[PDB]
Amino acid sequence: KSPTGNEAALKNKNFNKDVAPPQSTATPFDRHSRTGKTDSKKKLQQGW
Amino acid sequence: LVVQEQGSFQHILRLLNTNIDGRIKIMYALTKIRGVGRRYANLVCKKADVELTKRAGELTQEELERIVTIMQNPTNYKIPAWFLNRQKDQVDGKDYHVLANNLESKLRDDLERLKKIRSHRGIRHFWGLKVRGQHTKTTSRG
Amino acid sequence: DKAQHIVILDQEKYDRILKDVPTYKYVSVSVLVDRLKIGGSLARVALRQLEEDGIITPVLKHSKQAIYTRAQ
Amino acid sequence: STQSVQTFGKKKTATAVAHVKAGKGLIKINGSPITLVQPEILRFKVYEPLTLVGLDKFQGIDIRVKVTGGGHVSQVYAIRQAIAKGLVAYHQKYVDEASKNELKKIFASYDKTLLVADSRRMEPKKFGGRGARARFQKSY
Amino acid sequence: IHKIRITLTSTKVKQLENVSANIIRNAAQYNIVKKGPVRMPTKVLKITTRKTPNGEGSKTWDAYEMRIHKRVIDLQAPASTVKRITQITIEPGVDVEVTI
Amino acid sequence: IAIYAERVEERGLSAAVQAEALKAKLLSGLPIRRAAYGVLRFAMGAGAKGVEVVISGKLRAARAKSQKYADGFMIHSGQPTRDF
Amino acid sequence: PVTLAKVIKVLGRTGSRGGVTQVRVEFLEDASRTIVRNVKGPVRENDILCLMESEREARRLR
Amino acid sequence: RKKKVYTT
Amino acid sequence: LQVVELATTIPLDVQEAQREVKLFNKWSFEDVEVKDVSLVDYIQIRNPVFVSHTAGKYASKRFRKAQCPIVERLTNSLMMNGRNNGKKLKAVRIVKHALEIIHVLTEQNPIQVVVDAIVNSGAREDSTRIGSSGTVRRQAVDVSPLRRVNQAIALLTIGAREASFRNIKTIAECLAEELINAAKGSSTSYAIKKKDELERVAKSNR
Amino acid sequence: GRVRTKTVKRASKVLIERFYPKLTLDFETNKRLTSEIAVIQSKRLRNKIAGYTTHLMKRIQKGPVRGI
Amino acid sequence: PGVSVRDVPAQDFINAYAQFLQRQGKLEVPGYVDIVKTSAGNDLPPQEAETWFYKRAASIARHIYLRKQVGVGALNKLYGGAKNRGFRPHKHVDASGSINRKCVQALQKIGVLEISPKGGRRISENGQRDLDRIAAQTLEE
RNA sequence: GCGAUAACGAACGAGACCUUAACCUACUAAAUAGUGCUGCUAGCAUUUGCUGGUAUAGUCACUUCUUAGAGGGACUAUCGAUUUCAAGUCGAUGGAAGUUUGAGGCAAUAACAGGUCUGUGAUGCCCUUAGACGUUCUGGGCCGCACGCGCGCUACACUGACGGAGCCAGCGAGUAUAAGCCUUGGCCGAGAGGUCUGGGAAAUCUUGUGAAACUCCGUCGUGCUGGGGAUAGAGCAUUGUAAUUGUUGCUCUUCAACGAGGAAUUCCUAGUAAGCGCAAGUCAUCAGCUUGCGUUGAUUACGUCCCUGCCCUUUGUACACACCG
């Protein structure tokens, strides 16, 4: 069944025989910086 | 005014192999026949000179044959082509109005004629999905 | 699906109507349906004639409500 | 000319301008008699300014009102106000003020809206809801 | 004699009413019969945008406005007289068009 | 079209001139404190009722901060903010 | 045997949600035996609200 | 986010 | 009594309204009296109206509702359940027809039956809840005359509404049966079962 | 509520301490008087000030007031 | 007194002019009156198949009487109503143009209407004569 | 705010302010608004009257309604109660307006790892930069369907469906040698729509946007029924280069669940809620969406801290990157 049009009429929709997954939710410290580059007091003192 | 009759009422009618309740008004009793809607049944009753104030059982055989004749031959009774069920037919190109048993036969014949050429619309009919472009993400839950 | 109100008027119901409707404090479309077991459409035609025959006095006229009373 | 006073009554948007001239008891709504003002069930709203004082007050005056704007009910309230205010305004100008104060007493003692236009207007709609105070349903 | 119409449009009424009164003033000491000024119903040009440049936050809307005030003055005078009146009462905010 | 160039009478009372002047100083490397107070005192010297300068961004630090440099009397709400 | 008691003083809103009011009632006949009772609906002074049972005082509601 | 690979 | 000739002819019946103001020009308020001392000041029948449609401002202050005509308070409660909100002319039509049905039945003054049905439908003691943050608790308290009156109208129209749902009987004549039955204190009517059930539970809480 | 603010309460009592002989117990006269005594930017504030000055004047005639 | 169209209730005046206009019989009724729907927003043809065209022409004549040069497009708006769109909200849709245009054409050659200047269709010199007549013969009973 | 007072006297915010709605027969005018008169003119009774049409020359009058600018008007005004007799509150009376008069706009001191670099010829850095992650052309996708959830629209009928008839708003927008705007009127067409002219760059024309609920008279008669209109077949047009995976519109036919909804949970106090439509935005086409507008128009409090969030005071702290400690 090389062309997709010919095979479509032969493929059956076997969808009502399998059950949906029980759960399907698939879409954490925002305060803690993850950059890993802390700012020293000298840099703040020189800038501001 | 209220009038009485005896033995003339017919509780169950049989028209075009469809059982018709005889105590329903004639315009809406004929709508039980598949392929005959309120708009179409309203016109064949006016073409057959059957006044709409009659129940289905009130009608005599003479009127009943006159109605089934008109429904099967609409164009012969000055019924416009655009008012018909199956106009510009696929094979013979003439205006038709399919009825109770012919409707599902020619409805079927349209499905394989779509499926035989393997058109996209015919394919989606095979899968049992909506064919007119409706979204099926969230409403096709039946 | 239990209503099965009569829509065709035979002879037994016809004279029963003219013998029973006069003995009513208040007649209307529903009163005729409720107690005479006839259909609503048959009730509407019965009221329009019973008034013409003088048995029934029209207290008030309205499309959605027909308030009638005995004429005796 | 003649003894003519011109007034107006108002409801939400409906405004009825009444012309009161000296004449016979002619009372017209847009050139049509008041006995057939629609809707029928509110016909006594415009009969109130008539029957409260007595139709004898309208022997010498003819009233022709032109009501536009508003809606079906709002126009009825505009008409009855224009009639009541028109009768009073004619008395104040061409009759003694003792009678005008008399007429104003029966009207006011029955319904304030006969002489005083209702000041209620539609609140503007604010975003975040389909109405003035109503808001879109919130979900958690 | 010439029936001449002067149309005054602007966004702000202070300069509009000054020009309107000034034209009426010059049509008074000059014995020129006049009709106006006619205060045309003001036009509220309203544009309601979303506050957010992005699409996050409470759905808050701005409602900007641009009032347009229009006055028309009818004059019965020769064309030389009316045009020089316009230069007398020229104002940056108010634009003037003269039509016979 | 004819274009004329006119000098602004009170440079201290024009926020556009003061912001452009401040920008021409910040792009010259002058410190923010020395630059901010140069317009705070210039505005008051011209006779302003109040003046407030806010400079926001990042300065030699990965984290960004904002500093406000107010002076005098300032109104915030209602129509008068559109007038004065 | 219902008894009518005119209210003479609205004490204050009581109950958890404030939906019930303490009120000072006076009997229509035998203008004595003044009682404090609770009432559900809105109340002004001089309400002739009737009592199904009279021999019961009222206190604060929880 | 993808590496464009050629065929022709 | 004299017939006043106008240039615009005025019908005979409406000229009769000069003598007296009557509800729908058919029903008189003169011979109507509240058979309960405690609800006289909250059933307003002293000011006659022609039609139960005044479009007044009775929601501004606290007790202005007591000044609205009792029939207008009744026709206000008919237009409920969404599809009927704002359809006052339909509600007035129902009340106007209901009174006529109440007149041919029992022959009394229709608005007297309305007043009788209201005094007999308001529960005199309702059991308010005193639940301490979730737990079920009930305490028997008295019912104010205003709430007693306006709960009668709420219960009378609710009962009429449900009796006309999916029923060939029309709403105007369902209201007439509801008003007539409650006027004579019959327990068959809705809003008398409810009133008794309210006062029965209140008796089991004091 | 209808609680007057301090911009109207203190400005009104300055009028009494300054123009008591010319004041009166009539709001209409006070309203016109305060338009020639004080420079009020808005008519609404003028009516509020004159309306509270009248109240204070009406209260002084019933006895001595505290703070004025 | 002189009875006019404005002095008689509209609902029972049209029921009287429709009866007269049908019995007079000179109004030409198009052949599709038993087939057509009055408006695209309607779902069924008129229930009074034999008489609906006469009553509508009577309504059109009276409506034009009270106004000045109303066109046929305005008549479509006048008799149009709310369409029963299935799940989408209701909307106002105009009535059928041919039915209104045929009525005014039928009324224009029976002598009741004529082409008014600056568009529309005024009521005829005789249009007032026979409507005001029907009004007088409407309210004596 | 009153008041208590080691505080006194002030500033920002609140309030004032600004826009809008409600009053003005009190000013100022209006042929782009309306009216009365007057010409000329029609119909019906003939009573001289009643409804109209016409009049950018009748070269009339007026501003009441309409428009908008200058103002006036309310400040809780007056009178009763309560109160520390204070701030106030509750009742009446007058009033257009006595809920901050109704509704909004603006809106403090700091701050958030809140959201956007997918608005910017706003931007640092990193990546890519000729077989491009640049730009363009063609076709598809963003719609894809065993499922869970949210914002909504139709409904479950008779306080209703159809069928005729009555027939009332307000906020707005509108073009040219385009790349085509709003579009009446006439004529075709069952409709959708087509065609020929004209008006309007606009208080002038579309447009009185003759909107829908609504009201009257009929049919239906408690029936998954003439409630409901999914799903699907055939056909007819419109927009667009292009409609297939139906853009949308119209005709006939097909007649599905749904017969008022569990645990839970949302919005709301007066022209408000709820219905009911209409316009503008997106827009060649498409509105079950928003932004506004008007029609009809209520029930029930006018109270409390019982639930929930926030604020304040006291209190404990080994926290201060501050309990995500």
| Distance (Å, whole) CA E56 – CA E48 | 17
* Whole-angstrom distance, CA of residue I126 vs CA of residue I196: 10
Residues of G in contact with I145 (CB under 8 A): 41, 47-49
Which are the contacts of C21, defined by CB distance < 8 A and separation ≥ 6?
A: C27, C32, C36, C46, C50, C55, C56
Q: Enter the tokens of residue D99.
A: 């009678």
Contact G7, G47 (CB under 8 A): yes
Residues of chain B in contact with residue A6, where contact means CB-CB under 8 angstroms, are 118
Number of Cβ atoms within 10 Å of the Cβ of K7: 21
Find residue K93's DSSP bridge partners.
K81
Taking only Cα atoms into account, the Rg of chain G, rounded to an integer number of angstroms, comes to: 11
Backbone angles phi, psi at E95, to 5 degrees: -100, 155
Q: For residue A1, which amino acid is it?
A: K
Burial pattern D37-70, b for ≥16 Cβ within 10 A else e, equals beeebbbbbbbbbbbbbebebbeebbbbbbbeeb
Please, what is the Cα angle at K25 between K20 and K28, to 5 degrees?
Answer: 120
Alpha-carbon torsion angle A11, A13, A14, A15, nearest 10? 150
Q: Alpha-carbon Rg of chain K, whole angstroms? A: 16
Nearest C-alpha in F relative to A45: F60
C53 SS3 class: coil
- Kindly tell me the burial class for residue B69, based on how many C-beta atoms sit within 10 Å of its own C-beta (0-12, 13-18, 19 or more): middle
Q: Do A6 and B118 lie within an 8 Å CB cutoff?
A: yes
Q: Helix, strand or coil for residue E49?
A: strand
I131: contact with D, CB 8 A cutoff:
no
Q: Write the CB contacts of I183 (distance below 8 Å, at least 6 apart in sequence).
A: I113, I114, I116, I117, I120
Phi/psi of residue C6, nearest 5 degrees: -75, 130
Q: Dihedral of the CA atoms B119, B124, B128, B132 (nearest 10)?
A: -110
Q: Give the HSE-up count for residue K14: Cα atoms under 13 Å, Cβ half-sphere.
A: 17
- Which distant-in-sequence residues (6+ apart) come within 8 Å of I181 by Cβ? I188, I189, I192
Which residues does B contribute to its contact with A (CB < 8 Å)?
115, 118, 120, 122-123, 126-129
Whether B11 and B45 have beta carbons less than 8 Å apart is answered as: no
Residue of I13, I14, I20, I24 whose CA lies nearest to I72 = I24
Nucleotide closest to residue K38 (CA–C1')? L190
Method: cryo-EM
Bridge partners of residue D7, in order along the sequence: D18
3-state secondary structure of E76: strand
- D88 phi/psi in degrees, rounded to 5: -65, -45
d(CA D132, CA D121): 12
A24–B contact, CB cutoff 8 A = no
Distances (CA, A) of K92 to I64, K40, K81: 40, 10, 5
Concatenating the DSSP letter of every residue in D16-31 gives EEEEEEESSS-EEETT
Touch between chain I and chain D: 3 or more Cβ pairs under 8 Å? yes
Report the run of H or E that residue G27 belongs to, with start and end: strand G20-27
The full DSSP string for B88-120 is S-TTT---B---HHHHHHHHHHHHHHHHHTT-H
CA B59 to centroid of chain Cα atoms: 19
Q: How far apart are CA I148 and CA I146, in angstroms?
A: 5
Q: Whose CA is closest to F16, among F43, F47, F45?
A: F43
Tokens of F33: 């404190």
SS3 (DSSP) at J16: helix
The distance of Cα A40 from the centroid of its chain, to the nearest Å, equals: 36
* Cis peptide, bond prior to residue E37, ω within 30 of zero: yes
**I100: CB partners within 8 A, 6+ apart:** C59, C60, C67, I26, I110
Give dist(CA E72, CA E36) in Å, integer: 7
Task: Give counts: helices (H), strands (E), chain C.
Answer: 3, 2
Q: What are phi and psi of D15, to 5 degrees?
A: -135, 125
- Could you tell me which residues come within 8 angstroms of residue E32 by beta carbon, excluding any fewer than 6 positions away? E75, E76, E77, E81
Q: How far away is chain I from the Cα of G56, in angstroms, using its nearest Cα?
A: 9
Chain K contact set for B79 (CB, 8 A): 35
Instruction: Indicate the pairing of strand D27-29 with strand D61-68.
Output: parallel
Q: Which residues of A36-46 are buried (b: 16+ CB within 10 A; e: fewer)?
A: eeeeeeeeeee
- Cβ(C46)–Cβ(C24) under 8 Å? no
Chain D residues with CB under 8 Å of a chain I CB are: 23-28, 33-35, 39, 41-42, 44-45, 47-48, 50-51, 54-56, 58-59, 62, 73, 77, 110-111, 113, 118, 120
**Residue F67 CA to its chain's centroid (Å):** 13
For strand E95-99 and strand E3-10, is the pairing parallel, antiparallel, or unpaired? antiparallel
Whose C1' is closest to the CA of K15: which nucleotide?
Answer: L165
Number of neighbours of residue C40 by Cβ within 10 angstroms: 14
Q: By 3-state DSSP, what share of chain C in percent is helix, strand and coil, each rounded to 5?
A: 45, 15, 40
Residue with tokens 């090389």: A2
Q: How many CA atoms lie within 13 A of I183 on its CB side?
A: 19
CA of F60 to C1' of L216 (A): 83
Contact E13, E98 (CB under 8 A): no
Computed on alpha carbons and rounded to an integer, the radius of gyration of chain B in Å comes to 19
Count Cα atoms within 13 angstroms, Cβ side, for D72.
10
- DSSP β-ladder status, B18-21 and B12-15: antiparallel
CB count in 10 Å sphere of residue K87: 4
C-alpha F39/C-alpha F22 separation (Å) is 7
Q: Is K87 on the interface with B (CB under 8 A)?
A: no
Å from G20 to nearest chain I CA?
8
Count, residues in chain D = 140
Task: Say if CB G50 and CB I38 are below 8 A apart.
Answer: yes
Greatest extent of chain H over all pairs of C-alpha atoms, in Å: 22
Cα angle vertex A38, ends A37, A40, to 5°? 130
Q: Are I115 and I74 in contact (CB under 8 A)?
A: no
Q: Please name the chains neighbouring H, where neighbouring means 3+ C-beta pairs under 8 angstroms.
A: none
**What is the nearest CA distance from K87 to chain D, expressed in angstroms?**
20
- DSSP letter (8 states) at residue B82: G
Query: What is the residue type of I96?
Result: K
* Touching chains, I (3+ CB pairs < 8 A): C, D, G
What residue has token string 């002319």? I89
Burial per residue of B116-136, b for 16 or more beta-carbon CB atoms within 10 angstroms, e otherwise: eebeeebbbbbeeeeeeeeee
Nucleotide nearest to E60 (CA to C1'): L291
Three-state SS annotation for chain F: CCCCCCCCCCHHHCHHHHHHHHHHHHCCCCCHHHHHHHHHHHHHHHCCCEEEEEEEECCCCCCCEEEEEEEECCCCCCCHHHHC
- The residue written with tokens 């018709």 in the block is B20
Which residues, other chains included, contact I23 with Cβ-Cβ below 8 Å and sequence gap of 6+? I29, I48, I49, I50, I51, I52, I71, I99, I111
Q: Is residue I114 within 8 Å of residue I179, measured between CB atoms?
A: yes
For residues I37 and G6, the answer to whether their CB atoms sit within 8 Å is no
Nearest C-alpha in B relative to C10: B4
Distance between CA E31 and CA C61 in Å, rounded?
72
3-state class (DSSP) for residue B65: helix
Give backbone dihedrals phi and psi of B26, rounded to 5 degrees, phi first: -65, -40
Q: Yes or no: say if K121 and K64 are a contact pair by the CB < 8 Å rule.
A: yes
Residues in chain H: 8
Instruction: Please judge whether B118 and A13 are an interchain contact, meaning their C-beta atoms are less than 8 angstroms apart.
Output: no
Do the beta carbons of residue J22 and residue J16 sit within 8 Å?
no
**Separation of alpha carbons C31 and C23, rounded Å:** 12
Distance separating alpha carbons of residues K135 and K5, to the nearest angstrom:
6
Q: Locate E49 and state its tokens.
A: 């945008």
How many CA atoms does the CB half-sphere of D114 hold within 13 Å? 23
Q: G41: burial class by Cβ within 10 Å (0-12, 13-18, 19+)?
A: buried
CB-based contact, B8 to chain C, within 8 Å: no
Return d(Cα E84, Cα C69) in angstroms, integer: 87
Q: Nearest-CA neighbor of K138 among K56, K51, K24, K17? A: K17
Q: DSSP character for I38?
A: G
Question: Residue K26: which residues within 8 A CB-CB, separation 6 or more?
Answer: K110
Cβ contact (<8 Å) for B39 and K44?
yes
Which H, E and C letters describe chain K, residue by residue? CCCCHHHCCHHHHHHHHHHHHHHHCCCCCCCCCCCCCCECCCCCCCCCCCCHHHHHHHHHHHHHHCCCCECHHHHHHHHCEEECCCCCCCEEECECHHHHHHHHHHHHHCCCEEECCCCCEEECHHHHHHHHHHHHCCCCC
B-C C-beta contacts closer than 8 Å: 27
Distance, in Å, from the CA atom of D16 to the CA atom of D7, rounded to the nearest integer, reads 8
- Cβ–Cβ < 8 Å for D49, D80: yes
Strands (E), chain I: 125-129, 138-142
Say how far E67 CA is from L247 C1', in Å. Answer: 38
Count of C-beta atoms within a 10 Å radius of residue G30: 8
The DSSP secondary-structure symbol of D106 reads H
d(CA K10, CA I72): 30
Burial level of K98, CB count in 10 A (0-12/13-18/19+)? middle
Contacts of residue F58, defined as CB under 8 A and 6 or more positions apart, other chains included, come to: A47, F64, F65
Residue type, G27: F
Cβ neighbourhood burial of F80 (10 Å; 0-12, 13-18, 19+): exposed
What is the rounded CA–CA span in Å between residue K7 and residue I8?
10
| Closest listed residue to residue G51, CA positions, set D115, B124, D104, I141 | I141
Inter-chain touch F67–A43, beta carbons under 8 Å: no
Tokens of D3: 């003894």
Task: Output DSSP code: residue B86.
Answer: B
d(C-alpha D120, C-alpha D16), whole Å:
17
d(CA I9, CA I11): 7
Q: Which two tokens stand for residue I7?
A: 């240039």
> Is the omega angle on the peptide bond into residue E92 within 30 degrees of 0, that is, cis?
no
Other Cβ atoms closer than 10 A to K51: 14
The structure tokens listed for J44 are: 């609404």
Residue I148 DSSP class: H
Cα separations (Å) of E25 from E22, E31, E75, F65, F74?
5, 11, 12, 61, 43
Tokens describing residue C47: 């009221």
**Selected residue of D24, D35, D51, D53 to mutate for chain I interface (largest I Cβ count, 10 A):** D51
Distance from CA(J66) to C1'(L4), angstroms, rounded: 15
Contact flag B83-K35 (C-beta cutoff 8 Å): yes
Are there at least 3 beta-carbon pairs closer than 8 Å between G and A? Answer: no
Asked if residue E5 lies in contact with residue E98, where contact means CB atoms within 8 angstroms, the answer is yes
Number of Cβ within 10 Å of residue E71's Cβ equals 21
Cα K2 to Cα K7: distance, rounded to the nearest angstrom: 9
Measured between alpha carbons, how far is C10 from B57 in angstroms, rounded to an integer?
Answer: 14
Chain L bases having any atom below 7 Å from a protein CB: 1-3, 10-23, 25, 29-32, 34-37, 42-45, 49-54, 57, 64-70, 72-78, 86-92, 96-111, 113-116, 119-120, 131-133, 143-173, 184-194, 203, 207-208, 210-226, 228-236, 244-255, 259-260, 265-278, 287-307, 321-322, 324-325
Please count the other Cβ atoms lying within 10 Å of the Cβ belonging to residue F37: 14
The DSSP line for D31-88 is: TEEGGG-SSGGGHHHHHHHHHTT-GGGGSSEEEEEEEESS-HHHHHHHHHHHHHHHHH
Structure token digits, residue C51: 């008034």
Q: CA I136, I137, I140 angle in degrees (round to 5)?
A: 145
Contact indicator for K49, K61 with CB cutoff of 8 Å:
no
- List Cβ neighbours of G25 (8 Å cut-off, separation of 6 or more): G5, G6, G7, G8, G34, G35, G36, G37, G49, G51
Q: State how far the Cα of I111 lies from the Cα of I23, in Å rounded to an integer.
A: 9
